[PDB]
Each structure stands twice: as C-alpha cells, then as structure tokens.
Curated annotation (Swiss-Prot), chain A:
It comes from Escherichia coli (strain K12). Keywords: Methylation, Ribonucleoprotein, Ribosomal protein, RNA-binding, rRNA-binding. This is Small ribosomal subunit protein uS11. GO terms for molecular function: small ribosomal subunit rRNA binding; structural constituent of ribosome. SUPFAM superfamilies: Translational machinery components.
Curated annotation (Swiss-Prot), chain B:
One of its GO terms (cellular component) is cytosol. Probbly involved in recognition of ribosome rescue factor SmrB in stalled/collided disomes; fusion of protein fragments to its N-terminus decreases ribosome rescue in the presence of SmrB. This is Small ribosomal subunit protein bS21. The keyword Lyase does not apply. Coiled coil: none annotated. Part of the 30S ribosomal subunit. In stalled ribosomes contacts ribosome rescue factor SmrB. Residues 42-70 are annotated as: Disordered. The gene is rpsU. GO terms for molecular function: rRNA binding; structural constituent of ribosome. Keywords: Ribonucleoprotein, Ribosomal protein, RNA-binding, rRNA-binding. HAMAP family: Ribosomal_bS21 (MF_00358).
Swiss-Prot record, chain D:
One of the primary rRNA binding proteins, it binds directly to 16S rRNA where it helps nucleate assembly of the platform of the 30S subunit by binding and bridging several RNA helices of the 16S rRNA. Binds to its own mRNA, stabilizing it 5-UTR and preventing its translation. One of its GO terms (cellular component) is cytosol. GO terms for biological process: cytoplasmic translation; regulation of translation; ribosomal small subunit assembly; translation. It comes from Escherichia coli (strain K12). This is Small ribosomal subunit protein uS15. Part of the 30S ribosomal subunit. Forms a bridge to the 50S subunit in the 70S ribosome, contacting the 23S rRNA. The gene is rpsO. Keywords: Ribonucleoprotein, Ribosomal protein, RNA-binding, rRNA-binding, Translation regulation. One of its GO terms (molecular function) is structural constituent of ribosome. Induction: Part of the metY operon that extends to pnp, also has its own promoter. It comes from the Bacteria. Belongs to the universal ribosomal protein uS15 family. The lineage of its organism: Bacteria, Pseudomonadati, Pseudomonadota, Gammaproteobacteria, Enterobacterales.
Curated annotation (Swiss-Prot), chain E:
Binds as a heterodimer with protein bS6 to the central domain of the 16S rRNA, where it helps stabilize the platform of the 30S subunit. Belongs to the bacterial ribosomal protein bS18 family. Keywords: Acetylation, Ribonucleoprotein, Ribosomal protein, RNA-binding, rRNA-binding. The lineage of its organism: Bacteria, Pseudomonadati, Pseudomonadota, Gammaproteobacteria, Enterobacterales. It holds the Pfam family Ribosomal_S18. One of its GO terms (biological process) is cytoplasmic translation. This is Small ribosomal subunit protein bS18. InterPro entries: Ribosomal_bS18 (IPR001648), Ribosomal_bS18_CS (IPR018275), Ribosomal_bS18_sf (IPR036870). Part of the 30S ribosomal subunit. Forms a tight heterodimer with protein bS6. It comes from Escherichia coli (strain K12). One of its GO terms (molecular function) is structural constituent of ribosome. One of its GO terms (cellular component) is cytoplasm.
RNA sequence: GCUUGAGUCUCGUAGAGGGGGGUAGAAUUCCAGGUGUAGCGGUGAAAUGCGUAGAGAUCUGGAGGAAUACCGGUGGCGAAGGCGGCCCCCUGGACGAAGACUGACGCUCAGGUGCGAAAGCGUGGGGAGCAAACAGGAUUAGAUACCCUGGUAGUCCACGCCGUAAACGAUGUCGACUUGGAGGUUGUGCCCUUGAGGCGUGGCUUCCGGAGCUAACGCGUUAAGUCGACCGCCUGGGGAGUA
C-alpha cells in the first residue's frame, strides 16, 4: 500500500443509512464502513449514534495508508448529517475543508408520488 | 456551502460555521421539498394559504394590541 | 436598419487569428451598407465554468447596424467556425458607442 | 403591425388634406392593408389562434365601416370597394 | 432601498460584473428583492441580465460545478 | 347638422400574450472503464428485489429524453382554456402623454361559427423520470386496497378527432350614478429631483369596511347598492339529465 498523505471523506447520508468512504484526492477508495454493517439493523441504523461508528470503523480501516489531513464532502440529508464528522475529529484528523454536495436539480425529472400513509 | 477552514482555527469553529452556510443555501429545505411530487393544484393552494397566514396575523392580531388583555 | 450586439468567444489556441476574424466580420457588415459602431477586444479572459474541457477564452465585442439577413448569415458563420465556441447576438433598440466596463 | 411609412402613404392617398387620417375611406384601407399582409403570417402559422383573433377583429371592424358608408353615401361606397379590391 | 433608482439607470447591463456580484450569493443564487430592496421593475431586469451572463461565463451557475 | 359615445393617426411604456427556430446549465437513468469490499435498498417492523458472476459508495468518459432551482411576489399577460431558463425571427392586445381627424359609425344577441384543462381515440415517430393495468412482497378475519419492490399504456412530438371539468368569483355582457382607510404593480405631469422626498393625475389589481341590500352567511365604487338595454336559465324530492 503506497502511503498517501491526505484524502477526502465522502459521507453519503440518507434517511435510512450512512455510507462513509475515505478516499484520496483523486477519487480512489481506500476503505469504507456503513451504519448497517456496524451490527445495527432496521431502526437502530438510522440514528446519529449509529453513524459515528461508521466513521470510526472507517478511520480504523485506513490506518495503514497514513492519512493526516482529511476534508469532508457531505452528500444527502439524514440523522447522521452532523455526528459522522464529529467522530472524524476524534481520530486525530485536522479538518481541511467541509463541503456540501447534495445534488439539486433545477426542476429536471419528476419525483415519485406522495404517500397516503 | 463549500467551506475551507482557515489557518489557526479549531474544528468546532468550522463545524458551527458549516451549520450556518448550509441554511443560507437552503440545502435541507430543498431536499425535503423535491422528495415527492406536489400537484399544480397543491402548489397553488398552499401558496395562497400562507399569504392568508401572513396577512391575517399582521393586520388581524394588531387588534388585540390596540385593546388590552388585563 | 436594425441595431445588434454580438459577443463571440474564441478558443485560446487560435487567439492570433482574431485580428483576421474581426477584419472579415467588419467587411461582411460594411458590404451591405452597415454601420459598425463600436468594436472591442477583451483579451484572454478566465472562464467561470469549463466549456468543453478548457478554462480560458478570448472575448470580442462588436456592435453593428446591418440588415437582418447578413446578421443571420453571420450567425451561421459562427456555427461552423470551430474556433468560436459561444456567441450571443442580441438586438438593441438604440445605438451604443460607449466604452465597456471592462475596456475601462 | 403596419409600418410607419405605410400608414403615412395610405392616408396621403385616400384622404382629403393628407391630414384627416380618421375618415371612413382611410380607415378601411388601413384595415385592408393589414388583412392583406397577415395572409402570409397564417399560411405559415396555422396554430396561431391568439393572434388570428386579432385578425378577425379587423374584419368585423371593416364590415361595420362599409355598412356605415353604403347608406351614408352609395357613391363613395361604390368607389371604395372598386379600388381596394373588395367584393362586398 | 433601491440603488438603481438612485443611480437613475435605465438598463442593468449584463457586462457590468462588479455590480452583478452584489446580487448573487456565495453559491451564485440570485438574491431575493426583499433583502436587497431592489424595485420590482429593476429586479426583473436584474435577473434577466444575470441569466445572460451565466451563458457567457461571466458569472457561475453554482459554486460546485467543475 | 353638432361632439361628449365609438373609432383613426403620431410618440413612448410594461409584460410567463401567441406561433416558429436555436442554444445553455444542473439533475436522474443507462452504458463503458479505474479504485474498493461485503453489504445495499426499503419499512411502523419487515419481506420481495439487488449483491461475492464484485453491488452500494467514489472518480472519469460517452449516450439519450423530459423539465427549467434561485429570481418568484394574495406579482404580470390573456376572451376563457391557460402562459415560466436565455437568445433571434414573424405576430395579437392593453395602456399613458399631449395634438389633430371622421362624425352615432353604438350596445346586446335566439339560430350560426370559432376557441376550449386533463383523460381518451386515429396515423407516424420518441420514451430519461413518473405511472392506470398487471405481477410479486407485506398488512389484515379477508385486502381484488392503503404501504413496498418492479412495471405497460399513457405522459413528449407532428397532424387530425373528441367537446367535457367543482371549465367557479358556484356571481351573463354593456353603459350610468352613490361615504372612506391601508397596500402591490404599471404609466405621466409638475415643486427647491436641496435624495428614494413633497404634490397632483390615468389603467389594472389584493385586503378591510360605511350607507344600502340580504333568509342568514355575507356583498359592499372590481356590488350581491340604485338603475336602463338585451340575452341565458329555473318552477317539490326521487325515478332522471335516464328511457
Ligand atoms: Mg418510494
Ligand atoms: Mg389595430
Ligand atoms: Mg375638438
Ligand atoms: Mg364633424
Ligand atoms: Mg348558441
Ligand atoms: Mg394530453
Ligand atoms: Mg396517441
Ligand atoms: Mg404513440
Ligand atoms: Mg420505456
Ligand atoms: Mg407502485
Ligand atoms: Mg356542464
Ligand atoms: Mg380553472
Ligand atoms: Mg376556482
Ligand atoms: Mg355554473
Ligand atoms: Mg368586505
Ligand atoms: Mg335587491
Ligand atoms: Mg350588477
Ligand atoms: Mg342574493
Ligand atoms: Mg345522454
């Protein structure tokens, strides 16, 4: 494994899950961890506490690449919108940037129909 | 809300500054609105109910301030 | 006859052929009794977003009073010249001969 | 709409002192000149139902003026439709 | 309070880019007229010229597109 | 005969008014390739579904369709249906300022003719997303539903047809007359524009309310007030807008 000094965190938060992917600055994944793969299932995996171990198990998987600076690109809404980046400072990482990359259409395609629950 | 963190500045000062720039851009308010389709009837019916909400709180509640409560 | 404003964006490798392009597009107007009122050249300018894998282009402004048949003919000259990428030919009511805020 | 040197050229042809501009002979020919013009607009644009409604206003506004003139003066009526190219 | 009434300008030109950067936000969205105070005749001419200069790369559409 | 009704001319204004042709950015989907590795997706909870034949995530490149974030507003335009990126071309209407011009040329309208959302039909294309039908998974006593994963007509285009909607302001058109208050928008004139000020004057428009009307609710110079002209309509509930 070629030791790369820095990288980007991609935190794909949705209302049911959170996928954390540490990559480099060119877009090549180094390791990942999700909220449902943490031993969490159904309703437990869509909490803000379930998405910090997604960032902890992912920081624990990129220890051999030796990453010091790590900016964050947050995509999507969710309960782990905030607590996934709180626990990425706890792995000793100085934040470089924080980006918001939610895709916004300018009224393109038609979204699905309303739920009559 | 593309934020760079400035030199000699902690993480909480960049975290709370990120909880501000995502509300001026309307990021959370855009995603919940485009989650389901709203009809051209439904989009125009709520656009008038809020104009009644803004104007019947402005002019029709000042009456209790012209009068008194105790 | 009708006042127009044109602004066309040149590929930054063919930026030396712009004094050739301005001289051919001047004479196409004036060969049909057309006043060419002002004429500017904004230099290589940084783009705000990359059109077609490049970040810079060479901007030219040109204000013309021509008949509308030699203006549509100029729009299809920019359509097949691959040196020009974007043009925005746009009608004006009166004539303008002022300096730009970026010739300024 | 009919151009500036076209309404000044039909007033000067059918009016009295090149200045009356509102006489019945002048108004018919300015409506006739536009109805004759807009025939080429709607041979190209048949789905233009919003501006054809403005064309059919000029036709009803022309018939009301020719019905006015015909009992007001048969002699000026008969010479007006003889020159514009109208049949009634 | 409207500034194009104080200037007395009649056409908000899309090439005056030092002015048109006041009327977009950080992300490049057109700023509402309730906060700038632009008069409604001019806010229609403001947004018409910002959309004419996003076509010509004078202004960005969004702050994220590469 | 006359000039106030109705119209014409000159000069400007604002606007998603209409028809046609180009082009732009963002996003979804698919396809191809790199990195990566065991989960993804969904729910009240699940399961069907997708994944170890390498998914989901992430980066790059290409294709295609449909719609135009922000501006955007009880804002604008239109006879109504309705109309929203930006640019050109052809085009209809409204309105304002003074100034001439024609001289009752007007209003309404049975039969007639045209326009008329969406769905649907005929022919030819197009099809990304969405989705009647249909399918499977749940739920439930059952579940021909609601909820989930999919998915075809249809939605889009050209040209014909249909002729209906809670097509509503549940309020036919035209003209006249009768206290007021606070706003939006679009003009134009004048006063030191000493600045967006003050001061008149037109068009359209939202909200309140007086007299009056009203069964009451409410309406209230944009009338459902007081009038005139003309048209449409109604006459207990069901059977029936059916035979
Ligand atoms: Mg769904
Ligand atoms: Mg006319
Ligand atoms: Mg007079
Ligand atoms: Mg007279
Ligand atoms: Mg009838
Ligand atoms: Mg249809
Ligand atoms: Mg069909
Ligand atoms: Mg078909
Ligand atoms: Mg298909
Ligand atoms: Mg379904
Ligand atoms: Mg009916
Ligand atoms: Mg309707
Ligand atoms: Mg209604
Ligand atoms: Mg009715
Ligand atoms: Mg009231
Ligand atoms: Mg009564
Ligand atoms: Mg009445
Ligand atoms: Mg009544
Ligand atoms: Mg029947």
């Amino acid at each position: 494994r070629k030791q790369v000094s820095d990288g980007v965190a991609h935190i794909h938060a949705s209302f049911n899950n959170t996928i954390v992917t540490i990559t480099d600055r060119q877009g090549n994944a180094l390791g990942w961890a999700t909220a449902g793969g943490s031993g969490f299932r159904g309703s437990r995996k869509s909490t803000p506490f379930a998405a910090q171990v997604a960032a902890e198990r992912c920081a624990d998987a990129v220890k051999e690449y030796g990453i010091k600076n790590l900016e964050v690109m947050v995509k999507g809404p969710g309960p782990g919108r905030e607590s996934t980046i709180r626990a990425l400072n706890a792995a000793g990482f100085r934040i470089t940037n924080i980006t918001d990359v939610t895709p916004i259409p300018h009224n393109g395609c038609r979204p699905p129909k309303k739920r009559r629950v | 809300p593309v934020i760079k963190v400035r030199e000699n500045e902690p993480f909480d000062v960049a975290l709370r500054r990120f909880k501000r720039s995502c509300e001026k851009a309307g990021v959370l308010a855009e995603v919940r609105r485009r989650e389901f389709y709203e009809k051209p009837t439904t989009e125009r019916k709520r656009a008038k109910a809020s104009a009644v909400k803004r104007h019947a709180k402005k002019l029709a509640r000042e009456n209790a301030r012209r009068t008194r409560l105790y | 006859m009708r006042h127009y404003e044109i602004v066309f964006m040149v590929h930054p490798d063919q930026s030396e052929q712009v004094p050739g392009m301005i001289e051919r597009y001047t004479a196409a107007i004036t060969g049909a009794e057309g006043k060419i009122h002002r004429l500017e050249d904004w230099g290589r300018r940084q783009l705000a977003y990359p059109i077609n894998k490049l970040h810079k282009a060479h901007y030219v402004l040109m204000n013309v009073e021509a008949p509308q048949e030699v203006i549509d003919e100029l729009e299809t000259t920019f359509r097949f010249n691959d040196a020009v990428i974007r043009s925005m030919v746009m009608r004006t009511k009166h004539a303008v001969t002022e300096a730009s805020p970026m010739v300024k | 709409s009919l151009s500036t040197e076209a309404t000044a050229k039909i007033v000067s042809e059918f009016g009295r002192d090149a200045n009356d501009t509102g006489s019945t002979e002048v108004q018919v020919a300015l409506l006739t000149a536009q109805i004759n013009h807009l025939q080429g607009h709607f041979a190209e644009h048949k789905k233009d139902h919003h501006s054809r409604r403005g064309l059919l206003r000029m036709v009803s506004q022309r018939r009301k003026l020719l019905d006015y003139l015909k009992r007001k003066d048969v002699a000026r009526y008969t010479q007006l439709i003889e020159r514009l190219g109208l049949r009634r | 309070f409207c500034r194009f009434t104080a200037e007395g300008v009649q056409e908000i030109d899309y090439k005056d880019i030092a002015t048109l950067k006041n009327y977009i936000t950080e992300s490049g969205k057109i700023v509402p007229s309730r906060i700038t105070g632009t008069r409604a005749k001019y806010q229609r001419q403001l947004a018409r010229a910002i959309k004419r200069a996003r076509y010509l790369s004078l202004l960005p559409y969004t702050d994220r597109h590469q």
